[PDB]
Design an enzyme around this catalytic site. Structure first.
Site, PDB file in Angstrom:
ATOM      1  N   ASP A 129      42.997  49.095  32.128  1.00 58.04           N
ATOM      2  CA  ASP A 129      44.275  48.599  32.594  1.00 58.04           C
ATOM      3  C   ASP A 129      45.195  48.389  31.406  1.00 58.04           C
ATOM      4  O   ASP A 129      45.357  47.271  30.907  1.00 58.04           O
ATOM      5  CB  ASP A 129      44.101  47.296  33.352  1.00 58.04           C
ATOM      6  CG  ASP A 129      45.405  46.763  33.884  1.00 58.04           C
ATOM      7  OD1 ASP A 129      46.412  47.498  33.832  1.00 58.04           O
ATOM      8  OD2 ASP A 129      45.414  45.615  34.367  1.00 58.04           O
TER       9      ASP A 129
ATOM     10  N   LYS B  50      48.448  49.457  31.438  1.00 55.30           N
ATOM     11  CA  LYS B  50      49.850  49.426  31.889  1.00 55.30           C
ATOM     12  C   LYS B  50      50.697  50.399  31.076  1.00 55.30           C
ATOM     13  O   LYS B  50      51.758  50.032  30.560  1.00 55.30           O
ATOM     14  CB  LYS B  50      50.434  48.008  31.764  1.00 55.30           C
ATOM     15  CG  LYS B  50      49.783  46.969  32.679  1.00 55.30           C
ATOM     16  CD  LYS B  50      49.902  47.360  34.161  1.00 55.30           C
ATOM     17  CE  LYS B  50      49.585  46.151  35.074  1.00 55.30           C
ATOM     18  NZ  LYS B  50      48.242  45.604  34.722  1.00 55.30           N
TER      19      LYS B  50
ATOM     20  N   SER C  37      52.515  42.058  41.232  1.00 55.90           N
ATOM     21  CA  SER C  37      52.277  41.000  42.204  1.00 55.90           C
ATOM     22  C   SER C  37      52.982  39.685  41.861  1.00 55.90           C
ATOM     23  O   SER C  37      53.088  38.804  42.719  1.00 55.90           O
ATOM     24  CB  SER C  37      50.777  40.740  42.318  1.00 55.90           C
ATOM     25  OG  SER C  37      50.237  40.347  41.068  1.00 55.90           O
TER      26      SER C  37
ATOM     27  N   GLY D 263      43.379  34.893  44.963  1.00 56.30           N
ATOM     28  CA  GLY D 263      42.830  33.833  44.136  1.00 56.30           C
ATOM     29  C   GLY D 263      43.932  33.083  43.416  1.00 56.30           C
ATOM     30  O   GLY D 263      44.729  32.392  44.049  1.00 56.30           O
TER      31      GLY D 263
ATOM     32  N   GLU E 136      44.501  39.191  53.930  1.00 50.58           N
ATOM     33  CA  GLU E 136      44.824  40.282  54.846  1.00 50.58           C
ATOM     34  C   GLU E 136      45.082  41.594  54.103  1.00 50.58           C
ATOM     35  O   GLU E 136      45.129  42.659  54.725  1.00 50.58           O
ATOM     36  CB  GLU E 136      46.025  39.931  55.731  1.00 50.58           C
ATOM     37  CG  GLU E 136      45.798  38.725  56.618  1.00 50.58           C
ATOM     38  CD  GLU E 136      44.553  38.868  57.465  1.00 50.58           C
ATOM     39  OE1 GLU E 136      44.445  39.877  58.194  1.00 50.58           O
ATOM     40  OE2 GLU E 136      43.677  37.978  57.389  1.00 50.58           O
TER      41      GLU E 136
HETATM   42  O1  LIG Z   1      50.523  43.699  40.055  1.00 50.73           O
HETATM   43  C1  LIG Z   1      49.581  43.421  39.323  1.00 50.73           C
HETATM   44  C2  LIG Z   1      48.923  44.424  38.587  1.00 50.73           C
HETATM   45  C3  LIG Z   1      47.881  44.043  37.784  1.00 50.73           C
HETATM   46  O2  LIG Z   1      47.184  44.945  37.086  1.00 50.73           O
HETATM   47  N1  LIG Z   1      47.502  42.727  37.701  1.00 50.73           N
HETATM   48  C4  LIG Z   1      46.356  42.401  36.825  1.00 50.73           C
HETATM   49  O3  LIG Z   1      45.279  41.987  37.644  1.00 50.73           O
HETATM   50  C5  LIG Z   1      44.616  40.840  37.058  1.00 50.73           C
HETATM   51  C6  LIG Z   1      44.781  39.655  37.975  1.00 50.73           C
HETATM   52  O4  LIG Z   1      44.022  38.549  37.518  1.00 50.73           O
HETATM   53  P1  LIG Z   1      43.982  37.199  38.350  1.00 50.73           P
HETATM   54  O5  LIG Z   1      43.074  37.451  39.630  1.00 50.73           O
HETATM   55  O6  LIG Z   1      43.282  36.196  37.345  1.00 50.73           O
HETATM   56  O7  LIG Z   1      45.340  36.811  38.818  1.00 50.73           O
HETATM   57  C7  LIG Z   1      45.208  40.670  35.664  1.00 50.73           C
HETATM   58  O8  LIG Z   1      44.441  41.453  34.753  1.00 50.73           O
HETATM   59  C8  LIG Z   1      46.602  41.275  35.810  1.00 50.73           C
HETATM   60  O9  LIG Z   1      47.144  41.782  34.603  1.00 50.73           O
HETATM   61  C9  LIG Z   1      48.141  41.782  38.430  1.00 50.73           C
HETATM   62  O10 LIG Z   1      47.811  40.610  38.403  1.00 50.73           O
HETATM   63  N2  LIG Z   1      49.175  42.120  39.226  1.00 50.73           N
END
Ligand SMILES: O=c1cc(O)n([C@@H]2O[C@H](COP(=O)(O)O)[C@@H](O)[C@H]2O)c(=O)[nH]1
Ligand SMILES: O=c1cc(O)n([C@@H]2O[C@H](COP(=O)(O)O)[C@@H](O)[C@H]2O)c(=O)[nH]1
EC number: 4.1.1.23
Lengths: 212, 212
Positions: free
Chosen positions: A60, A62, A117, A172, A179
């Protein structure tokens, strides 16, 4: 979907030995391990080779640069045993195509981010998210990253994507909706697994809650 | 502008010793060294501390994630002696604000990317580039990355930026216009310097051509 879905660990710790520990103890409950820059910068890119002996590794990174440097980043990821890489669609089709080209040399997969997200993802990414789906599809990407925190948009992305693989973060810590499983092929969880007293138990329980 | 401008080496090689040799050779002619993931992944993040003994180091990490992850990446860059970091404005104000907050802890600077100099940058970034300038300014960013390959757009970005520092890549390999000097505070060159028989000579001649 009706089919088997994945639980994907976002292993966002900053010590390689700690990363290996966590991956090993949750291995029964997770299908792939997503590694991002905090871990890779801390432990070295070689940590992906070590983790890959436990579960397949998604790099990942990005990827979000011009094609020349994006190409090099993708190549380094695949040289270090990643099964796949993550690239931003917002940087354009030329970078998408080039990352996909590098991936093909390795038999790897490329996932394009549609919109993040986080709340910030709504500022610019949401407006072009569906167009990114179109461009990612045309460029030959193997899947998409789409958010569990905006379930109505996730549905729309699934409709535009057809049967393209979709991985969804946000459940989380970010309070995304469970969903999301209706539309996702894989659910990504970081803190909800590793930031706990018993990561293996949390991963076990997540599968139950998500019904996957 | 009328003031002294910088020539910034984009040191996109993939060996640490090679990077150090090039940096030392061209030091007389360059003001800062920009380091991206191909070098950091190849040589380790510690290469930034070594390079910083030659010239200040910009950590060009194209930070493009949710705030949580972005914060960690920025922190690691500054812990490894970077004077500044580069972040994508496209991912939103929450990430911009968080990266700036981490930077302040270290006395560091943050540059926000407006739109990439590659053709792909026109697909999505161009349409929101000016809004990114506004958001970056409001978030407390200390500068912008803006393209020498689209001179009319660079002019618009400077007007929107007021006196924010602007660094411009694209001259040399990407055939950006040297007229970018009029609007830029710093000119970034990678291949035009390092991908040559005599990098020091190329850097020397670039300063004369750019009149900086
Ligand atoms: O839209 C996105 C895309 C992601 O890769 N991520 C990645 O997914 C992971 C989410 O971690 P967490 O469940 O602790 O929120 C992190 O590594 C973050 O960089 C995200 O949270 N949202
Ligand atoms: O819009 C942008 C922003 C960049 O950081 N860059 C970066 O600037 C450098 C340009 O190198 P080159 O002079 O070899 O084209 C690369 O490190 C690239 O990732 C760019 O080319 N365009």
């Amino acid at each position: 979907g009706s089919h088997m879905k994945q639980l994907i660990l976002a292993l966002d710790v900053m010590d390689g030995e700690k990363a290996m520990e966590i991956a090993k103890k949750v291995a029964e409950h997770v299908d792939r391990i997503k590694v991002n820059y905090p871990l890779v910068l801390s432990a070295g890119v070689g940590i992906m080779k070590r983790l890959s002996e436990i579960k397949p590794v998604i790099a990942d990174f990005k990827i979000a640069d011009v094609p020349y440097t994006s190409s090099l980043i993708a190549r380094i990821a695949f040289e270090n045993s990643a099964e796949s890489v993550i690239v931003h669609g917002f940087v354009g089709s030329d970078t998408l195509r080039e990352v996909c080209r590098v991936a093909e040399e390795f038999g790897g997969k490329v996932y394009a981010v549609t919109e993040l997200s986080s709340p910030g993802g709504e500022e610019f990414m949401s407006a072009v998210s569906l167009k990114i789906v179109e461009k990612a599809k045309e460029a030959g990407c193997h899947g998409l990253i789409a958010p569990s925190t905006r379930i109505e948009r996730l549905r729309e992305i699934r409709k535009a994507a057809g049967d393209m693989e979709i991985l969804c973060p946000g459940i989380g810590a970010q309070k995304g909706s469970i969903e999301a499983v209706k539309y996702a092929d894989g659910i990504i969880v970081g803190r909800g697994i590793y930031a706990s007293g018993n990561p293996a138990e949390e991963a076990r329980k997540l599968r139950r809650v998500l019904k996957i």
